[PDB]
Ligand binder design. Sequence first.
Ligand code: HEM
Ligand code: HEM
Ligand code: HEM
Ligand code: HEM
Lengths: 146, 146, 141, 141
Amino acid sequence: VHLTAAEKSAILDLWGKVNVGEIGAEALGRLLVVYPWTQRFFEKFGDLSSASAIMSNAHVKSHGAKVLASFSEGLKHLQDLKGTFAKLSELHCDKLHVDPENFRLLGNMIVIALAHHHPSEFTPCTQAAFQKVTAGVANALAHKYH
Amino acid sequence: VHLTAAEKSAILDLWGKVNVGEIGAEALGRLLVVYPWTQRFFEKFGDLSSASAIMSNAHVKSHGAKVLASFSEGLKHLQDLKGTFAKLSELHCDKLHVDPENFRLLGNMIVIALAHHHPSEFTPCTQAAFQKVTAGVANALAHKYH
Amino acid sequence: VLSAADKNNVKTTWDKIGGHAAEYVAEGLTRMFTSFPTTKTYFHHIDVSPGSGDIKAHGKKVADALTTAVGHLDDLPTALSTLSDVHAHKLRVDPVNFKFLNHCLLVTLAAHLGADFTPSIHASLDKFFASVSTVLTSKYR
Amino acid sequence: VLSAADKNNVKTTWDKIGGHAAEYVAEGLTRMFTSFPTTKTYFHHIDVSPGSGDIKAHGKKVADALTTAVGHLDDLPTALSTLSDVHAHKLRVDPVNFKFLNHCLLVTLAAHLGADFTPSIHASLDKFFASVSTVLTSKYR
Ligand code: HEM
Ligand code: HEM
Ligand code: HEM
Ligand code: HEM
């Protein structure tokens, strides 16, 4: 994906205000609650059979934070997302066989977590910029499929 | 997408037996009947308000044949689908704004037309090879989105 | 398929939103037009500038239709039949556009409801909007 | 949402298929395992070689469940409740796998039915398989 300087600024201005681990814990938690088949990939974490269990699980919190730190690193490499995410693409595609639609769903959960915690800053224009970058990260993660 | 020599042979062996215009007319006809929102792109063709009308429409037949000749040309360029389909990607993405899921649906209609007319040849292994090439063509047509 | 718990989550949340529904749906439409500009093609006939009177008016129509759906959770196809005619037969709307709108509605609710937009409420609402979309894109009568 | 014409297309075609249903579903499973090899992960416990007795047996189970659905087109959620428990709660099957199977079932029917697999019959069957998938991937009871 190509992002304009305006879009990149809308993204990075908000990102400087974001608690990356808290966004990550919420986004991954919401993924598992809203799209329950995604739990199949994370059985080792413990009981994921209720929203209550998912949202209190320590591994969901720590893994969510790890995912969002990885996303943050991506934001430093907006002109080379495919290269940045190549090793993770090999992992998620060749080893884990995650269907790429699920990458887009997790991106949408990050968007929802941002709206929840930063409503005044998460304007329609700023959302639009984030939709482009979450789509870009999903496309990069899916590259080994193509 | 990467295709093995075995897969390419399964594809091209069957293709030598195929009536390209007839497959094309059937595949596009089935797209319009099965997924009716796709009719929005082809209003100029005439009445598309019934299966009967869609399957008798001369423009659906001629356009279907044109689509399948384009697909045939692609089969000559399996190591460079992105380059082969670049101009058509610009058209379908930047000018027509066709959602890429629809490229995959049309690929699946070509698969169904092949099974209909070549059941003995359309074995599970030969189908598998075709699924890879229709996915590849869809990905190439969608490239301007990424 | 919505569970009875999903239906209760939808009814309770919609009721809490109450008279803000039209305003929230207008915001959802503006979010859709902004994040997914290809959706604007269906609305060439109105002013789609952010904050426009035309978007406010359309947001009211859409909110009132969602109210009809919330009141008929056991039989959405009967309740939304005329709207399916509009969206499937007349306008031929590609289903991806509904995915775009539904996501933008959830983003709007997350922004306004905060902590009250729980993961469980979010899941029930996602199922509800998806069910409405399936009906509006079906040709059944 | 299926129209009454869709329901008639499904009933008539299923009846014509008759006792071939199990054989056709086994072929559909083999087409799925071959074209979409990631689906094999769910079937690690059986022999999934083409023509295997295990695939024949599973094809019979799936065909008989599709027969239950064809007999309950006005209320699939009630009729398929136990199977939703299996596929959504117990096995957590990603919905993409249903897209793969449904397509492979339609390819199988196109191969065996030829001209009798009309575009109209194809459309009704696509809607029917999609409706079944929506139920089997829902958590409602
Ligand atoms: C924004 C999209 C995503 C990003 C940036 C991301 C990033 C990561 C990272 C950084 C790791 C750790 C790699 C390592 O241990 O070396 C990981 C592992 C993993 N990811 Fe993702 N991921 C994404 C989406 C998904 C999705 C959608 C799923 C499945 C629904 C998934 C399933 C997994 C699994 C199962 C692991 C291994 C966990 C374990 O057992 O330790 N990921 N991912
Ligand atoms: C296998 C995938 C596809 C291929 C190979 C393909 C190929 C083509 C070709 C060769 C043309 C003619 C270009 C020209 O006139 O210079 C065309 C035009 C067009 N395509 Fe596609 N196409 C595909 C999928 C689709 C889909 C899924 C849609 C919409 C649902 C679509 C909508 C159109 C439209 C609206 C035109 C212009 C028709 C006219 O008004 O003359 N195409 N395509
Ligand atoms: C939550 C899902 C939706 C609901 C409940 C809904 C509801 C409505 C209602 C109540 C009307 C007015 C019908 C009338 O005046 O007779 C309408 C019209 C319309 N809808 Fe939707 N709609 C939905 C999604 C969409 C989407 C996703 C699109 C396209 C992106 C769309 C495009 C249109 C258009 C073009 C009209 C007619 C234009 C107009 O009324 O001025 N709708 N819709
Ligand atoms: C047309 C849609 C489907 C129908 C009607 C269906 C039906 C069934 C039935 C009747 C059973 C046996 C339940 C029992 O013995 O109590 C079953 C089991 C199972 N299904 Fe499905 N199924 C469908 C789609 C899928 C898909 C797409 C997958 C994964 C790719 C899947 C994976 C499984 C697994 C792993 C089992 C248990 C293993 C076994 O029975 O040996 N099913 N299904």
